[PDB]
Amino acid sequence: MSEYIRVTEDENDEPIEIPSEDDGTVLLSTVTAQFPGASGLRYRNPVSQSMRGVRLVEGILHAPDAGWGNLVYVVNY
Numbered sequence: 001m002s003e004y005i006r007v008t009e010d011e012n013d014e015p016i017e018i019p020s021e022d023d024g025t026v027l028l029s030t031v032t033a034q035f036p037g038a039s040g041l042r043y044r045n046p047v048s049q050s051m052r053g054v055r056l057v058e059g060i061l062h063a064p065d066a067g068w069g070n071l072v073y074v075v076n077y
Contacts (some may be wrong), residue, residue, distance in 0.1 A: 005063065007037050009075035011044045028061035036077030037069070046071045058067070 003024070008015035009029050020026050030039035041054035041061070055062035055075065063069060 003069060005010070005070040005073065006043075007073040007075065009035065011072065011074055013075075015072040024063040024065065024069075026061045027059070028056050029059045031061060032077065035075070035077075037075040040076030042074030042076050043071040044074060064077055 003022075004017055004018060004019045005026075006015050006017055028039065037054075039056065041056075042051040043054065044051060051074055054073065055064075
């Protein structure tokens with residue numbers, strides 16, 4: 001039972017599958033400690049194919065309670 005998310009800087013860069021915290025949450029700032037999407041999100045497709053970004057709350061990156069999950073994120077910072 002391991003929910004994970006998908007990220008890439010460009011939709012056609014190298015999208016990657018990565019595990020997340022059970023809350024549907026991830027250390028956003030700790031993520032930005034590099035080029036991972038850093039502090040901003042977009043993503044492609046398993047929703048509405050809309051380039052939409054991921055929640056940032058008090059340093060956390062949060063996915064919706066039970067929305068989609070692990071779309072292929074586009075990378076914005």
